[PDB]
């Protein structure tokens, strides 16, 4: 997609600094609009970041921190909106880039030399921050009050100039010292200090060089169509103040007709539907969680809806990071009770060391592995799953065997939907898992963990931008040294662990949750019928024949005959005498025929027929 998520990493070090560079090479690959923050952190001088060239707009802020790159490939960035801000104050932050005076000689030790943000035309909220970048030139010769939006001049700025090197002047082809950088490509744009009076925007000094009111990042022609980025919405190349309404009204009655020319609101845009993992809402918002008194429903096209509870809504179970558990860092002895029998979770799940070695001063108990059984009902998670400790008695993640999907609408550090770190364990066992709705999956420092290369990660994602990220685990050469793999019946060798209960799809048949070579149609005593590759008993009257069987479906009339007696149509080991009525007629003393038919008696009581022609009905 041309739209991607931003991140939330704000001067935390990477959970794997080694595989951090390639995480960004997936997440931002050819992205044009960032739904979040653009963070560039701890990136070394060798970093081929050229895939960032396509970013046109950021809805959050930009943070470029602690990097040893000489330059940043961001020359296409038109504008930043500041829907979030760094320290609630800043929309562009440049921190601590180069080296902090280590014991290291290298003549180009990184640090950003220049601005080179050659497109940046507007900032709609928040200030600018630059600190401890001793390599940086030209940040001081900028008219930042052209770029700060005229109608929201929250123009705080804190810029460092403590250089440890010289700066020569920018190319004299510029109209004075107004530059991004050193070359004749690198002149600063002006769009507000070359304009006057009613011209809130222009491309030049004339009244014809002015731009339309909806146009933030400048214009080419004078019309609302002619514009390089727009202040409120883009709809189909029209710069609209609002998205078009989804309803038409009577104007007096306010009786309502749906409008097919309506759109939903999503980021900087108006769209006719919400993208795959989001929620559609009655008022036309595309969201992550439903509004209060709206439920997330299983809408027909899979594109979920938030529609209205005409009774009080069902008490769905919150995960960590939502309502009841927003601030709550961990599953513990106290909140594990709140998941008992829950099948969809509204939030995330997290296992830290402190989840299991629970603190007696913050008076919680250490966690028993048996308390984890409360999750075995779980079908779906709206947030993420994070694991950084596990009990040494569990070689696997068995309590999640029934989990189909993790959405990642909430993400760990804004980026990750599944984390499995430092756990030691040998396999995963997640047999039902078939979807990762958004965000990356991280699996690192796991001592014995085999078979992670056998999972068809292809089938779980819904964009070309997500990957599995792995390092410091078990060698897969030492997994063939263990002599084990996925089982013979695992389709293309795809599994979650060792044996017939672990395959992602089965080559032959399913006996309950066992993938098997064949089923007991002929080959044994407990006979099993086939139901579209599943295998099941009847009620036990498919009596073993030498080449056939006796009741196919568990409505016991269906393979060929009966084993001992018939009560038409069904089959039994004895004609029965029930002592509960509903209506005042029990099965009256059903005598066997010679072909075993269980026939009722010909007089109501008193006179004859008790199977032995005796006395066993009352009166």
């Amino acid at each position, epitope marked *: 997609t041309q739209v991607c998520t931003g991140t939330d990493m704000k001067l935390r070090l990477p959970a794997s600094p080694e595989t951090h560079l390639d995480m960004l090479r997936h997440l931002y690959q050819g992205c044009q609009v960032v739904q979040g923050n653009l963070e560039l952190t701890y990136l070394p001088t060798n970093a081929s970041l050229s895939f960032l060239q396509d970013i046109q707009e950021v809805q959050g802020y930009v943070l470029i921190a602690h990097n040893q790159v000489r330059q940043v490939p961001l020359q296409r960035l038109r504008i930043v909106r500041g829907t979030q801000l760094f320290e609630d104050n800043y929309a562009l932050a440049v921190l601590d880039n180069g080296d902090p005076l280590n014991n290291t000689t290298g003549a180009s030790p990184g640090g950003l030399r220049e601005l080179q943000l050659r497109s940046l035309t507007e900032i709609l909220k928040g200030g600018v921050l630059i600190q401890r970048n001793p390599q940086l030139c030209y940040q001081d010769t900028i008219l930042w009050k052209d770029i700060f939006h005229k109608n929201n001049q929250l123009a705080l700025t804190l810029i460092d100039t403590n250089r440890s090197r010289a700066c020569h002047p920018c190319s004299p082809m510029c109209k004075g010292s107004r530059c991004w950088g050193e070359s004749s490509e690198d002149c600063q744009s002006l769009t507000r200090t070359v304009c006057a009076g009613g011209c809130a925007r222009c491309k030049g000094p004339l009244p014809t060089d002015c731009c339309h009111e909806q146009c933030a990042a400048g214009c080419t022609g004078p019309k609302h169509s002619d514009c390089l980025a727009c202040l409120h919405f883009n709809h189909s190349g029209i710069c609209e103040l609002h998205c078009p309404a989804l309803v038409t009204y009577n104007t007096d009655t306010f009786e309502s007709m749906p409008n097919p020319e309506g759109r939903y609101t999503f980021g900087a845009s108006c769209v006719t539907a919400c993208p795959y993992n989001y929620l559609s809402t009655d008022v036309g918002s595309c969201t992550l969680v439903c509004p209060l008194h709206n439920q997330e429903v299983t809408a027909e096209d899979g594109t979920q809806r938030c529609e209205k509870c005409s009774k009080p809504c069902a008490r769905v179970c919150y995960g960590l990071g939502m309502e009841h558990l927003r601030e709550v860092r961990a599953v513990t002895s106290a909140n594990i009770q709140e998941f008992a029998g829950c099948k969809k979770i509204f939030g995330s799940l997290a296992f830290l060391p402190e989840s299991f070695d629970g603190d007696p001063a913050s008076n919680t108990a250490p966690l028993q592995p048996e308390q984890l059984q409360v999750f075995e009902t779980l079908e779906e998670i709206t947030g993420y799953l994070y694991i950084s400790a596990w009990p040494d008695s569990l070689p696997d993640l068995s309590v999640f065997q029934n989990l189909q999907v993790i959405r990642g609408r909430i993400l760990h550090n804004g980026a990750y939907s599944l984390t499995l770190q430092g756990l030691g364990i040998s396999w995963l066992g997640l047999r039902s898992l078939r979807e990762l709705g958004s965000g990356l999956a991280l699996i690192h420092h796991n001592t014995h963990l085999c078979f992670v290369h056998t999972v068809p990660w292809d089938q779980l994602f819904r964009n070309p931008h997500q990957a599995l990220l792995h390092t410091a685990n078990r060698p897969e050469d030492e997994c063939v040294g263990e002599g084990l793999a996925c089982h013979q019946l695992c389709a293309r060798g795809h599994c979650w662990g060792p044996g017939p209960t672990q395959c992602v799809n089965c080559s032959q048949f399913l006996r309950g949750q066992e993938c098997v070579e064949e089923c007991r149609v002929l080959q044994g005593l407990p006979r099993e019928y086939v139901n579209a590759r599943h295998c099941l008993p009847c009620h036990p009257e498919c009596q073993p024949q030498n080449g056939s069987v006796t009741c196919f479906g568990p*409505e016991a009339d269906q393979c060929v005959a009966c084993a001992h007696y018939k009560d038409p149509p*069904f089959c039994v080991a004895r004609c029965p005498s029930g002592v509960k009525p509903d209506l005042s007629y029990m*099965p009256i003393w059903k005598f066997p025929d010679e072909e075993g038919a269980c026939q009722p008696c010909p007089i109501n009581c008193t006179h004859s027929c008790v199977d032995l022609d005796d006395k066993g009905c009352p009166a």
Partner: nanobody
Amino acid sequence: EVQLVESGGGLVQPGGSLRLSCAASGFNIKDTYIHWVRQAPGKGLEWVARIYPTNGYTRYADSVKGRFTISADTSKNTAYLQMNSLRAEDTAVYYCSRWGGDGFYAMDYWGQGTLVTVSS
């Protein structure tokens, strides 16, 4: 007597769907199959489907095999026929009935019925 009540019969397009509904009275569905049956108007009968509401087992006739599905709410004393891929060969007066105790597969309790029609 013990008795039922049919509902949800009506007029439909061919190829379309209709959901019939049948509630139970004088008993509560646990020793139970619930059936659907239909009459060619003032002529022959045809049996359509059964459900056992106490475990969800279902069976069908060769005319509605792979077209229709029978279903129930075993708490709300009610069973349903989900008819789909409808035909002119479905214009009939529909009826619902019971069995209970398998040695008595004879249909004693029923409701008032409802018409079903399929047309342009």
